[PDB]
Design a protein around this ligand. Structure first.
Ligand code: GTP
Ligand code: GTP
Ligand code: MG
Ligand code: MG
Ligand code: MG
Ligand code: MG
Lengths: 168, 57, 57, 168
């Protein structure tokens, strides 16, 4: 319905970290516990006020089972931000973070704003990745960092807000 | 958990089912590739069909 | 064709592999449905992407 | 490159009867022995002289494993001819012919020109469906009939020629 900027943002990260529920939570305020691996490629849009401006965030999602495939170029084409997501309760998803980083360096624009997102912060009893360790990694690598829970919503808005404002 | 068959039989059954999973895997890969190759085209031509929710244009 | 395991073991192996084929089948169906639902949209909007050979428009 | 008529034709029939090789043989003069079940939906076009006229035949193909699915309406939409194909060496594919006929009645235009095609006529030693039996069935049901071999090419042109001229 008009807007001052249209920003393409992509979700990337291991399968199971909660990419699709960060999407549905941001764009529809919906969460699904019985959430199947994403087939294909899709996007959803949401308009938000960031400063004085209205921004159409065009959020893209796909399976993070594979690294590079035929849709990869088209997926990063025109993307001005990536949310790179791991699962705070699965150390492996966090080990894979640098693998996804290389993948961005290889296929995204050199100026992509990348935010590192540790998701599933509701699983405090099951934590496998200390905030500090991830915090350390992010600043070392020029990345914004945040922890979210698509399940209970903590920081989901803040995460999209932050990346979008840093794209300005 | 179900008896009846000899060790020999349950054993060629296992082989037959391994070969069947191999065929299913292959098919899954073929399906995946077809999807990816079709999405490239959808993406370059009419990306709006990938919108959620789907607005027919 | 390969020994080693007890009749008991080869037998829970068979159960484990049946359940695995069931999961692969389900996945094949999910892939098929996604394809069909995407093709409806491709067909109604830009059927030319289904041309062989593919001329980018 | 211009033409006097554009005709949409669809292939239907059991999986394995040779639908996709009738397609490649007609449109590209190619045959493949190692031919996988068709994924998705596709078409290929070919222009031919039929009488004085040039006709773009737009030939559609898909898997014949399923009867009715989400693509079915769109598949028959605008189709002016169907080649309904069985395998002369597999009696089952021929038993399924009336099932495919009902499917046409249910989803195609009431004026679709339908041709019945017994394919794999190169398999003379393996014949399961006598020509007469199929010939009988076709005329009884208002259908043109022909036997083809996508493998050796017999009647493939004649088949498309006939259906296209009967669409005029
Ligand atoms: N506890 C908890 N579970 C979550 C959270 N986010 C997602 N999940 C669950 O984790 C599973 C995976 O979520 P998805 O959104 O499908 O993750 P995905 O990253 O998109 O998976 P792929 O498409 O295969 O790459 C689902 O069972 C979700 O319900 C969260 O914040 N907390
Ligand atoms: N001998 C012989 N084999 C043929 C002929 N036409 C097709 N075949 C073979 O039969 C098999 C099936 O051929 P296809 O063209 O893939 O048949 P299909 O009907 O399109 O199968 P679906 O896509 O699953 O519905 C392949 O192995 C072909 O090589 C023919 O005229 N003669
Ligand atoms: Mg997903
Ligand atoms: Mg990817
Ligand atoms: Mg086929
Ligand atoms: Mg069909």
């Amino acid at each position: 319905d008009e807007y001052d900027y249209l920003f393409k943002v992509v979700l990337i990260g291991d399968s199971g970290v909660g990419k699709s529920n960060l999407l549905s939570r941001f764009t529809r305020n919906e969460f699904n516990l019985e959430s199947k691996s994403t087939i294909g490629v899709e996007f959803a849009t949401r308009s938000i006020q960031v400063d004085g401006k209205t921004i159409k965030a065009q959020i893209w999602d796909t399976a993070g089972l594979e690294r590079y495939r035929a849709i990869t170029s088209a997926y990063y084409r025109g993307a001005v931000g990536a949310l790179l997501v791991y699962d705070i309760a699965k150390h492996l998803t966090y080990e894979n973070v640098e693998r996804w980083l290389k993948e961005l360096r290889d296929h995204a624009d050199s100026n992509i704003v990348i935010m590192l997102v540790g998701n599933k912060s509701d699983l405090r009893h099951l934590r496998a990745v200390p905030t500090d360790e991830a915090r350390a990694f992010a600043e070392k690598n020029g990345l914004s960092f945040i922890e979210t829970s698509a399940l209970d919503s903590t920081n989901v808005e803040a995460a999209f807000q932050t990346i979008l404002t840093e794209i300005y | 958990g179900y008896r009846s068959l000899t060790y020999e039989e349950v054993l060629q059954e296992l082989v037959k089912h391994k070969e069947l999973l191999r065929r299913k895997d292959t098919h899954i890969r073929e399906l995946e590739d077809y999807i990816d190759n079709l999405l490239v085209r959808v993406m370059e031509e009419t990306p709006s069909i990938l919108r959620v929710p789907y607005e027919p244009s």
